[PDB]
Design a protein around this ligand. Sequence first.
Ligand SMILES: Nc1ncnc2c1ncn2[C@@H]1O[C@H](COP(=O)(O)OP(=O)(O)NP(=O)(O)O)[C@@H](O)[C@H]1O
Ligand SMILES: Nc1ncnc2c1ncn2[C@@H]1O[C@H](COP(=O)(O)OP(=O)(O)NP(=O)(O)O)[C@@H](O)[C@H]1O
Ligand SMILES: Nc1ncnc2c1ncn2[C@@H]1O[C@H](COP(=O)(O)OP(=O)(O)NP(=O)(O)O)[C@@H](O)[C@H]1O
Ligand SMILES: Nc1ncnc2c1ncn2[C@@H]1O[C@H](COP(=O)(O)OP(=O)(O)NP(=O)(O)O)[C@@H](O)[C@H]1O
Ligand SMILES: [K+]
Ligand SMILES: [K+]
Ligand SMILES: [K+]
Ligand SMILES: [K+]
Ligand SMILES: [Mg+2]
Ligand SMILES: [Mg+2]
Ligand SMILES: [Mg+2]
Ligand SMILES: [Mg+2]
Ligand SMILES: [Mg+2]
Ligand SMILES: [Mg+2]
Ligand SMILES: [Mg+2]
Ligand SMILES: [Mg+2]
Lengths: 375, 375, 375, 375
Amino acid sequence: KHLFTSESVSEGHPDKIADQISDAVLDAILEQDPKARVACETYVKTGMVLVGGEITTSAWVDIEKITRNTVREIGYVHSDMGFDANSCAVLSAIGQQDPLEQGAGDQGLMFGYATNETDVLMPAPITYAHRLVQRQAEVRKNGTLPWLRPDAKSQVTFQYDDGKIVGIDAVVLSTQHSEEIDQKSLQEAVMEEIIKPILPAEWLTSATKFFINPTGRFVIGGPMGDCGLTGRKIIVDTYGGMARHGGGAFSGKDPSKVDRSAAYAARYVAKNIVAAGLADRCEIQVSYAIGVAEPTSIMVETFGTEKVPSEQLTLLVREFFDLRPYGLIQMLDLLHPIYKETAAYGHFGREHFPWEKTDKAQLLRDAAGLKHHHH
Amino acid sequence: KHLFTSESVSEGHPDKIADQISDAVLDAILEQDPKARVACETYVKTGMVLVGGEITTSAWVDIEKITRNTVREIGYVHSDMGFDANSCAVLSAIGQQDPLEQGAGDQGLMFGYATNETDVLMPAPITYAHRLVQRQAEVRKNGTLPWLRPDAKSQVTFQYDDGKIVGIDAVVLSTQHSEEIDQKSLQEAVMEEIIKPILPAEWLTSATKFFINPTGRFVIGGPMGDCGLTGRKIIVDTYGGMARHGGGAFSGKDPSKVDRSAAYAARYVAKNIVAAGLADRCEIQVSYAIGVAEPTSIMVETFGTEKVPSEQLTLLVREFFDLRPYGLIQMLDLLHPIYKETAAYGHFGREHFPWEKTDKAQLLRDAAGLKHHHH
Amino acid sequence: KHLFTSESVSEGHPDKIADQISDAVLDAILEQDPKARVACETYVKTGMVLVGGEITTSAWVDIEKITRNTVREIGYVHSDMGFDANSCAVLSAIGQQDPLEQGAGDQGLMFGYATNETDVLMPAPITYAHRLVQRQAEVRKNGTLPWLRPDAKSQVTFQYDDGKIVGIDAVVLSTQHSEEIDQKSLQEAVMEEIIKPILPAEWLTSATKFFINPTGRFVIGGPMGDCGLTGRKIIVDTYGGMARHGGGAFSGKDPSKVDRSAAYAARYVAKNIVAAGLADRCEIQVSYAIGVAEPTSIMVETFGTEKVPSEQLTLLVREFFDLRPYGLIQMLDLLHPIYKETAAYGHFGREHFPWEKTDKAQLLRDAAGLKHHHH
Amino acid sequence: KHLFTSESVSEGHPDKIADQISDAVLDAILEQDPKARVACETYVKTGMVLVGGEITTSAWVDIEKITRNTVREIGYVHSDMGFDANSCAVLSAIGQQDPLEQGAGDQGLMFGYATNETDVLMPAPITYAHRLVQRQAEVRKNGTLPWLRPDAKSQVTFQYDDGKIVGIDAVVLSTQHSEEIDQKSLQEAVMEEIIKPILPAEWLTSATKFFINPTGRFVIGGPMGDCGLTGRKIIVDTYGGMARHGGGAFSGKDPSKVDRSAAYAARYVAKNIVAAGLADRCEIQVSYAIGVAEPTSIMVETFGTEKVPSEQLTLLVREFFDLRPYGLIQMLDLLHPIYKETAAYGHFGREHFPWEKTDKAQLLRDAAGLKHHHH
Ligand SMILES: Nc1ncnc2c1ncn2[C@@H]1O[C@H](COP(=O)(O)OP(=O)(O)NP(=O)(O)O)[C@@H](O)[C@H]1O
Ligand SMILES: Nc1ncnc2c1ncn2[C@@H]1O[C@H](COP(=O)(O)OP(=O)(O)NP(=O)(O)O)[C@@H](O)[C@H]1O
Ligand SMILES: Nc1ncnc2c1ncn2[C@@H]1O[C@H](COP(=O)(O)OP(=O)(O)NP(=O)(O)O)[C@@H](O)[C@H]1O
Ligand SMILES: Nc1ncnc2c1ncn2[C@@H]1O[C@H](COP(=O)(O)OP(=O)(O)NP(=O)(O)O)[C@@H](O)[C@H]1O
Ligand SMILES: [K+]
Ligand SMILES: [K+]
Ligand SMILES: [K+]
Ligand SMILES: [K+]
Ligand SMILES: [Mg+2]
Ligand SMILES: [Mg+2]
Ligand SMILES: [Mg+2]
Ligand SMILES: [Mg+2]
Ligand SMILES: [Mg+2]
Ligand SMILES: [Mg+2]
Ligand SMILES: [Mg+2]
Ligand SMILES: [Mg+2]
């Protein structure tokens, strides 16, 4: 019997604004130069975006237009909301100053995770936290609730009973909105259009507490309310705290940065082990030394749910997966402008991303000797 | 049998520069106004520091002098190193626009952890990673190795055998340095002055791999090499990945921000459970809803090492600890300028910090009914 | 027979926005510390104000609130106008690191001028250019023309016939406005409310050309349209080109800066010579060497209109006026927060400023031996 | 009998640093796109360059490399001098969002001047002020005085006797320098290498005062000492105060901006009148209305030195010169990357610039009927 909690934030949360600008700049560069080196760090606050860092590329991009386009899409288009794509400041401080045996670009450690408690092999709490804010954005943009504004957060507390979901104990939904909607109207609409359509009714009972805009009015937000920086939502981006984290941010980094590529690979590995039926849950840790191709370490954790000995799993992983930094890029077909889409609503659990394919599961299952004997 | 890896970075790593500026600004404010509200986000890169965010305070501080003093102390005092305290740009964009029942200032989730694998009740990998970079800084500043420069990283891979440390498998030490030292000289000096004095000789064997400045020369660094931002080393700041993380950054936040205060409290709770002998390792999760005083959730995880039933532990925690946001500040005496010291070499494991006191351990032990029966 | 032209700009022109922020910061400091050293340079463009330079002061000022207050007063309060006081970025980069024999703080040259072609002893073209934009601001702010927006420019071409004003040949008035007013409506209203009430009807004839918003619609302006910097309207600030200029900017400089104080003194000198009847027009040049109290040069130019020999005038000036840098501050009572008012609509010709007093005129006249002999 | 004073500043003065960055960016764009629209405003101070404004161009330029290259050429290459090309911050905030009948892009007024008191038809004071700082830069860069640093100023006071140069009354030379040179050594070297080789010995007498580094040591300078902005040396750029000024800055503006093109044209006109022998000195004023091709006014001032009636001169100017904004660009062949060279040591008096050609002088002389009758 334990209570576990995860959160997510909408595309209009200031940290998420920064992540999406960083990745919109990455995508624009990769469209022209797939092998670009990009380390693009964004900082947003009242009236301004600062886009900085380092790029090595043949590409020619307009950082200001990409930034303004990104903010406009998120929905900040007027001073009444606290922030305007068309009239904010955009400052740029980007410095433009056998292949599988290439060393890691940096040291570090990265984790990946999978669990069969959902069909996408993700933890339920982060899954439903993301779906809530993704729903908030959908009913804002489609005109179902046209008074919604871009900045929102969600938080879901699940109840477990020896590792089985019993229900949802608590739900937090805080949304920005225009001045005209009153709080009772806002709470009813958020319950009917956002919460009830996303959370399974089975998990919602008399024991469920709902905190909808628990401080009431939330008119001013996005960067006016809170400074936002790239890489400040790394637990929202991953597994909502259910799994460990190595500390590296994803957004604004090209696929040569093992902080992103090896975390994607570790998800792919974990997900294929669980899809194979070789465990019910699996956490992978990998680590690198700058200038060294072979990871300094690989760890496979199955929390006692493995269907074959743990040492045999570690072997299967070395056998089927090339975790050298350029083996990663090959393994996942990463040199394409696919990253802006990851930079809100989570890097995992959306099954069109290359690191969410379970195209190794039968291979691992066969290689492990799992198959039924008769008679 | 598993390999686990943690890293740390010196006070001269650009992300750590940002953390220390943010907390130097917090301390300067709390010295004058202990109840200040501070959310100070720093961004450093080639030639500049940007210090931004939001403060509510009666204090009057010189952000530029605090910044320059902080960078000078870290050791960046010349263009030859890539960055100069005295001549860099400092830009400021800080907007200055029953008490225990006060609501949390934000939603979120926070973890704390303790393990008796070290005397300070920390995981060994993060402990020894921090000690390595702390040693690098000490031999740089005391003139033992005067050619060292401020930017460094460490990484240590431990070998476990069913949860007992067998040894150290791999050690990474990457340090900045002046142009005059050659790499063989640098590797010998780092082995003799930094590595061998910090890592127990028992754990160092023929199986131990050493990667000292594995890309060779590292003359240019700090902000010139890599943009740095507040809150981009949250796993170095905590448990090196051994424990989970809720995603919140510590530095530049006053103690009313549950991202910092509740993580400190969760460490205090976990550490006192383990010091009490109520478990060998303990992870606490807590979460809040904005405007709500009582946490939305509390979870006590003991990984099967508890000495009393798990439900009884959850009770002991509600009984002995007030996890309401202002109960935290009272519980830990937090309204003092003590934070710059946390902003490099880890927020945990240094036992003079208030959240590292084990002043509840005997209390919890007595309350749990642990004591020996004779005859 | 010659045509001469001068321009002026409203308080909402971006260069004038910068001047007024610089001087609002100066005034706020002098209110607390009359002997402050201030060199405050402002830069405005789309979404941002940067306030920089150097101050030596005991004062404690909130640069962000002063900036936002200044922009709000000018009238930029919405993204629809291109700029919002409440939601723009404000960045600060101000470094806070016998008395009459004190040296000049810098070298330089400064001119002052007076002419009896107006009652305020100013050239008519700059006088009427300022009055036009000052009128534009008055009918905008008083609701006479509520659709006006803050950014405007004026330009007036006078016809002279051997140095006597014959009339006005050309009038330019370009004003920002809201989207709702059509251009014919705007032209009629500007002619009736701004032009006809300010320019003497005697000077307006069939030969007069009027260019009112000659490019038509002007909805977007202020910083969105044009970057603005302190000290980029030095000819609008002075004599509209009728007199020479030494190149120094006024705004954001305390009275120890001879670029401001000696130009004010040179106006005072010229104005008192002309008010004395010792010439009909008078241009003064003074210059300084850094660290030298006595000006390196003084020149008195009367364009052949002197009523006493030129050498005798130069003597009268050395006799009645102390042009040493601290003699200036004493001569004009300058250590008071009086400067924001100078930073739009001209530093000269408004007779409540201390350098516009003619309290030496009778003294100079008596000392020159001008007085009527009878019989 | 009158004393007149002019100043100049070296390429390392912070305002001049800004002018040269603005024009280096203009040149880089015009090299690729001769018809680019450019309005590039620079701001330099401790540790940073901000390059902003508005460009309409097909060109692709690296603002950061152009900036760093420009600062390096000027000579700021180390923190010991206060500023380093290689390690300063560069921030960019440039928004990239019958032909002779095209309207002026803005209103305004512009002056041009010529006088036969020098062979280049410039006033002597500005001529010799520029030559002094140009000499300071030459002996710094050629290693004659290798301890010189980039920031310097000059100021020269000439004595006139009814409009004829009698001599030089005062000379100011303030130069930055390294820590190693003492002030007596510096004064002797500046007198021998900079002053005596540039100023005619005839003009230097017992009455001449010399102020060499009159405040002594000047080690820290460039942007560390003083914020610099584009367009803050408009009187150094033109005629040193001898002639009037319309207020417009030159640097960072493409030739479609009448603030630059019409001032260049007005110099060309004045210079060709004086070279023709139609006056000994000539000041031209022109002015424009936004969206109007024909200037709102033209004024020809000859200070009583004309050799033909004044009305006939005004006619000659309308006849020989097309002052419509695109007539200017054609008249002077302006669509070429020639502007960085203007942005230090004066826009006039260097006779390879297109507006310094006297290719109309014989034409004007013939058209005026000036020629000798015999017998
Ligand atoms: N030549 C070099 N050799 C070795 N290490 C180097 C070298 N140059 C820089 N580094 C280090 O590499 C560091 C990068 O650390 P880190 O902040 O983790 O990078 P990041 O890519 O921004 N990721 P994170 O902030 O963790 O998401 C630099 O800041 C230096 O400490
Ligand atoms: N009136 C309000 N009511 C509720 N939520 C609000 C209100 N105002 C702002 N918020 C939200 O609170 C958010 C803060 O999120 P977060 O980024 O986690 O904060 P942080 O303190 O910088 N911590 P982190 O970046 O996680 O270390 C804002 O950006 C909004 O989404
Ligand atoms: N110690 C010093 N001795 C002499 N001159 C110095 C010293 N320190 C700096 N200076 C010079 O003084 C200059 C100031 O020039 P200037 O740009 O005219 O100043 P300003 O006050 O901004 N006025 P302006 O831009 O003309 O309105 C510096 O930039 C240096 O060239
Ligand atoms: N559509 C428009 N119609 C008319 N005037 C306009 C329009 N858009 C902007 N303007 C004005 O044109 C001004 C330009 O003034 P000014 O500051 O003299 O320009 P500049 O080119 O930077 N020159 P200076 O600072 O004088 O060297 C703008 O700031 C507005 O007042
Ligand atoms: K923040
Ligand atoms: K970075
Ligand atoms: K401009
Ligand atoms: K300045
Ligand atoms: Mg945040
Ligand atoms: Mg990292
Ligand atoms: Mg980093
Ligand atoms: Mg948070
Ligand atoms: Mg301007
Ligand atoms: Mg000056
Ligand atoms: Mg200046
Ligand atoms: Mg102009």
